[PDB]
Amino acid sequence: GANKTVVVTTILESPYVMMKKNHEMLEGNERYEGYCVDLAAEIAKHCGFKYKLTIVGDGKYGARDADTKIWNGMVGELVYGKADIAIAPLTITYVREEVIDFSKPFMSLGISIMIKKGTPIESAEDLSKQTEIAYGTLDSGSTKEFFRRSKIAVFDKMWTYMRSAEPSVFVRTTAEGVARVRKSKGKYAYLLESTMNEYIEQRKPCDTMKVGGNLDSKGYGIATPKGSSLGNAVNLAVLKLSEQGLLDKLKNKWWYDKGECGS
Amino acid sequence: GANKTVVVTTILESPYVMMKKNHEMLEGNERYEGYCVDLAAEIAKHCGFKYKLTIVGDGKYGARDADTKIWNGMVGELVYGKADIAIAPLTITYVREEVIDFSKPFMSLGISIMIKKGTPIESAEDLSKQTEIAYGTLDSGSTKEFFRRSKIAVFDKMWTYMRSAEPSVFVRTTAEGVARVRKSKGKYAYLLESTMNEYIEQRKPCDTMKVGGNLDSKGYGIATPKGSSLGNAVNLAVLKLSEQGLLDKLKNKWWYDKGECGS
Ligand SMILES: O=S1(=O)NCN(C2CC2)c2ccc(O)cc21
Ligand SMILES: O=S1(=O)NCN(C2CC2)c2ccc(O)cc21
Ligand SMILES: N[C@@H](CCC(=O)O)C(=O)O
Ligand SMILES: N[C@@H](CCC(=O)O)C(=O)O
Ligand SMILES: [Cl-]
Ligand SMILES: [Cl-]
Ligand SMILES: [Cl-]
């Protein structure tokens, strides 16, 4: 048929997608800025489509309900035909790859530990061997599923603690996890992706830091409904931008060029 | 060969694929050992196929002849139907993605610099600003094509030197590049992938090292002919091995430090 505007689902997560100054008087794509906003423009240019950025209604990345088997979040938007493509920090996983298509990765990450500066923790092993410092993850995302599914001893032990901790150690947004670290005087550590960890490390008031190596190795991919014709072009577009060095420049732009914690 | 046997093309490259001690009295797949040999056994187990490891005839990774547009190396064996799958340190690239299918990556790497210890080079920009130290890459692989195609200023400069330098700064195998670094009294630096660089750095005679950050970011993927029915299962197998932590275990095994260098 005729060309249609591509519906892009994404999520309000700094610095991938953020509300612009003066958004209250702006409309459409102009309301937003950030890494994924820039990336969407580049992909659309190379692929020759027009698009509309739409923030996912429930504010979630995507998990499948154990009983109803219904997908929520951005994954759900794709699975149920509400969006044509997701351009977001959406982690490539086995269970997701089974139900949606992913491009080759446009950014790499690993699960990591965020602490308030001075917290006596240097590794996940350290966390699992004490009880004074609480720790948790984001809901409805790939980090929580990693711990839940892990057969690796240290991570299984961490999940056994987190799943039953009271009050809840899980948070609904990355921002909530960051606040909890910042406000708990070193008694909360947050498990999150190294990308978001490194970003927060560069923001005022510069009171957090990433410690230890990453617990795993994966990446974000641009996602489409299974078998979507958009897939092939978008995938080549990611590899081209990668080869051209544009993805490296975009990360530098949003993470470090305007970092708030010094040069 | 035998019916229902998957033909695997691979390449002799330590520690991915190596001839076992006393291989001359062994036969078939048992002649070989290494990271990729272990990976092939794991992939074949998950996907349920029997397979035959074959070393690529011309000992090359894969490039397209500018004149004849003919692909050589492992890429060629996939394109012209000599093999069903490549399980090897074969780099995901834009130009290759256009002609073959790649799994999601099973290992990450970047282009990196290998120098003789003591060499006064700390970066790619350093190499480009001087002319006493020669430098080159492997023929018929992705590192050479990267420099040839690059519009990034420093890399374009390096390519302008390398393509015309004489005697040829290019080498036929990784071992030959490493040997040249070791014998040139510091007057040759080798551009190779960080994985191989890191492997060599830990082996006797302990006289090489990796310097600077990586020049780019990419990975190896398991490759199949375009539209192969094997693609989907192999891809899911890679993500499953990744999430089980088996790719990390395999890396730790074949990059295991026995302390040939230092403590
Ligand atoms: O999630 S993935 O596509 N497969 C697993 N791996 C690691 C290398 C094995 C990575 C690594 C980096 C990346 O950007 C994406 C992936
Ligand atoms: O070659 S790729 O599939 N696309 C480009 N990128 C980098 C993150 C943008 C990576 C990174 C790591 C990896 O293992 C594979 C790839
Ligand atoms: N990027 C993750 C969300 C963040 C996290 O789980 O730590 C996902 O796609 O689910
Ligand atoms: N992994 C490379 C070969 C080594 C190199 O080019 O440095 C390829 O697939 O072409
Ligand atoms: Cl429309
Ligand atoms: Cl021998
Ligand atoms: Cl010329």
From Swiss-Prot, chains A, B:
The chain holds residues 413 to 796 of 883 of the full protein. It comes from Rattus norvegicus (Rat). L-glutamate binds at P89, T91, R96, S142, T143, E193. The M4 transmembrane segment mediates tetramerization and is required for cell surface expression. The postsynaptic actions of L-glutamate are mediated by a variety of receptors that are named according to their selective agonists. This receptor binds AMPA (quisqualate) > L-glutamate > kainate. The record marks R64, R148, K240 as: Interaction with the cone snail toxin Con-ikot-ikot. The record marks I121 as: Crucial to convey clamshell closure to channel opening. Glycans are attached at N3. Ionotropic glutamate receptor that functions as a ligand-gated cation channel, gated by L-glutamate and glutamatergic agonists such as alpha-amino-3-hydroxy-5-methyl-4-isoxazolepropionic acid (AMPA), quisqualic acid, and kainic acid. L-glutamate acts as an excitatory neurotransmitter at many synapses in the central nervous system and plays an important role in fast excitatory synaptic transmission. Homotetramer or heterotetramer of pore-forming glutamate receptor subunits. Tetramers may be formed by the dimerization of dimers. May interact with MPP4. Forms a ternary complex with GRIP1 and CSPG4. Interacts with ATAD1 in an ATP-dependent manner. ATAD1-catalyzed ATP hydrolysis disrupts binding to ATAD1 and to GRIP1 and leads to AMPAR complex disassembly. Interacts with GRIP2. Interacts with GRIP1. Interacts with NSF via its C-terminus. Interacts with CACNG2, PICK1 and GRIP2. Interacts with GRIA1 and SYNDIG1. Part of a complex containing GRIA2, NSF and NAPA and/or NAPB. Belongs to the glutamate-gated ion channel (TC 1.A.10.1) family. GRIA2 subfamily. The modification Phosphoserine is found at S150, S184. Palmitoylated. Depalmitoylated upon L-glutamate stimulation. Induction: Down-regulated in the pyramidal cell layer of CA1 in the hippocampus by global ischemia. Disulfide bonds join C206-C261. Residues 120-263 are extracellular. Detected in forebrain. Detected in dendrites of neuronal cells. Expressed in the pyramidal cell layers of CA1 and CA3 and in the granule cell layer of the dentate gyrus. It is found in: Cell membrane; Postsynaptic cell membrane; Postsynaptic density membrane. This is Glutamate receptor 2.
